[PDB]
Ligand binder design. Structure first.
Ligand SMILES: *[C@@H]1O[C@H](CO)[C@@H](O[C@@H]2O[C@H](CO)[C@@H](O[C@@H]3O[C@H](CO[C@H]4O[C@H](CO[C@H]5O[C@H](CO)[C@@H](O)[C@H](O)[C@@H]5O[C@H]5O[C@H](CO)[C@@H](O)[C@H](O)[C@@H]5O)[C@@H](O)[C@H](O[C@H]5O[C@H](CO)[C@@H](O)[C@H](O)[C@@H]5O)[C@@H]4O)[C@@H](O)[C@H](O[C@H]4O[C@H](CO)[C@@H](O)[C@H](O)[C@@H]4O[C@H]4O[C@H](CO)[C@@H](O)[C@H](O)[C@@H]4O)[C@@H]3O)[C@H](O)[C@H]2NC(C)=O)[C@H](O)[C@H]1NC(C)=O
Ligand SMILES: CCCCCCCC/C=C\CCCCCCCC(=O)O[C@@H](COC(=O)CCCCCCCCCCCCCCC)COP(=O)([O-])OCC[N+](C)(C)C
Lengths: 218, 50, 62, 49
């Protein structure tokens, strides 16, 4: 302008460093910042001041994976002990982002639910048929092959164990416990009287008590 | 760009109580540092080698 | 109750702590440029590598 | 009866569908506004299995 007022508005791709918390992934909220300042000058030569309290999101393209909850900018003054009256200035904009948890519910969670229900089904299958181990171990194989999708999709960071990973590991130990207990049931079924005599506690608890207690049965 | 008879590399120095000491380490702001998701720093020395 | 709150080597200033606050702190750390000293009310937690002191008397965080 | 392999066949079809999950996982868009038709059909068939 003819008064010397200058307005410059250049574009930029900002790649910022951000502490990412994955404790609640895929239902996690992130607070991400952009710290700006003058590099070679101090607050006595070049002063900066924010134009508004909140960033400008009037032309913001909706994301598809994230929802903007709040955003605000703050200006800071920093003094050092070596220089009593020299301030160092910086404006810090922050953005609070909530994740849309659908891609990760349909691609990682529903299969785990399915596998857990199947892990429970094995106990209604009679040992006379020779397929209890087939069923159990095939459920385990499917879960191990799904691990390939989990490793392809989930973030491989070691800051903490995510919630989705706690669930994957609960399912794993659930399946493995089912398999162990299935092997103990099969062993108890093919038990030869020639070598093993039924003890009194087993004949009392599993023949004369629970059968009667069991209501939902035939 | 220059040989050791023309340019000498050294480590920078500080002052605590009128005395000088060399800065034999990488400097890390303990307040503005976000740790890496997979790697934690144990040692970070610095050395002038001849 | 009454604590200093000025930064580093700034002209001394004071603040009044919130009802109940029995403590007072002094946080110091260094970066590429120099040494920063933060003072205020309470006894806060701090990231590793930072000096921290806490005091339950009056104007004792200088 | 023992030898018909009814569970064998059904659980092996489930395993094959679990491999098709990884194959599709490598191709679908990663947005979260709608569920694709291919992934919807995979969920359907795995629930029927
Ligand atoms: C997501 O992540 C985000 C990033 O991590 C996170 O952002 C953070 O948000 C919080 C808020 O939730 C922000 O906190 C606010 O920060 C404001 C800015 O602080 C800086 O500036 C202060 C002012 O400095 C001027 O005034 C001083 C005297 O008062 C002078 O000593 C200074 O030299 C300077 O003077 C200049 O300006 C004067 C007036 O403009 C002028 O007279 C003078 O001549 C000269 O020109 C500094 O004091 C302050 O420094 C303090 O804090 C730093 C640490 O940040 C310490 O190291 C320092 O030692 C020092 O203690 C900063 O440099 C603050 O103003 C604001 O404070 C007010 O509110 C808090 C609330 O707790 C009060 O405790 C405080 O007393 C203030 O009270 C206010 O109360 C009401 C309004 O609420 C009002 O009536 C009253 O008058 C007063 O204003 C507050 O702390 C924080 O900065 C953000 N961090 C960032 C951006 O990194 C975000 O929250 C996250 N989101 C989530 C998790 O949801
Ligand atoms: C599918 C599971 C298998 C199934 O249908 O049978 C289970 C459903 O009976 C249940 O036990 C259903 C409830 C699941 C376990 C309890 C859930 C929490 C309470 C067990 O049925 P049952 O009572 O052991 O069956 C007796 C024979 N009958 C089927 C002629 C009644």
């Amino acid at each position: 302008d003819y008064t010397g007022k200058i307005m410059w508005t250049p574009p930029a791709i900002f790649k910022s460093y951000c502490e990412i918390i994955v404790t609640h992934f895929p239902f996690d909220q992130q607070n991400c910042t952009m710290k700006l300042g003058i590099w070679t000058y101090d607050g006595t030569k070049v002063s900066i001041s924010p134009e508004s309290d909140r960033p400008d999101l009037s032309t913001f393209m909706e994301s598809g994976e994230w929802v903007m909850k709040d955003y605000r900018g703050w200006k800071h003054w920093v003094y050092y002990t070596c220089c009593p009256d020299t301030p160092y200035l910086d404006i810090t904009y922050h953005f609070i982002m909530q994740r849309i948890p659908l891609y990760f519910v349909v691609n990682v969670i529903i299969p785990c639910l399915l596998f857990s229900f199947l892990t429970g089904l094995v106990f209604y299958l009679p040992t006379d048929s020779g397929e209890k181990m087939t069923l159990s171990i095939s459920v385990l194989l499917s879960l191990t092959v799904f691990l390939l999708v989990i490793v392809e999709l989930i973030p491989s960071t070691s800051s903490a164990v995510p919630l989705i990973g706690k669930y994957m590991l609960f399912t794993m130990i659930f399946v493995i416990s089912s398999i162990i207990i299935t092997v103990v049931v099969i062993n108890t079924h093919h038990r030869s009287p020639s070598t093993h005599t039924m003890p009194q506690w087993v004949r009392k608890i599993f023949i004369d008590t629970i059968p009667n207690v069991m209501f939902f049965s035939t | 760009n220059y040989d050791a008879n023309e340019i000498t590399m050294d480590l920078m120095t500080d002052t605590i109580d009128g005395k000088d000491y060399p800065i034999e380490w990488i400097i890390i702001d303990p307040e503005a540092f976000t740790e890496n998701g997979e790697w934690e720093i144990i040692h970070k020395p610095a050395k002038k080698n001849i | 109750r009454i604590c200093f709150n000025h930064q580093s080597s700034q002209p001394q200033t004071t603040k009044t702590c919130s009802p109940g606050e029995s403590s007072c702190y002094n946080k110091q750390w260094s970066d590429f440029r120099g040494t920063i000293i933060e003072r205020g009310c309470g006894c806060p937690t701090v990231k590793p590598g930072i000096k921290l002191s806490c005091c339950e008397s009056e104007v004792c965080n200088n | 009866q023992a030898g018909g392999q009814k569970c064998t066949l059904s659980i092996s079809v489930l395993l094959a569908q679990t491999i098709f999950l990884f194959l599709i996982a490598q191709k679908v868009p990663e947005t979260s506004l709608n569920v694709p038709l291919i992934g919807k059909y995979l969920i359907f068939v795995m629930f029927v299995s």
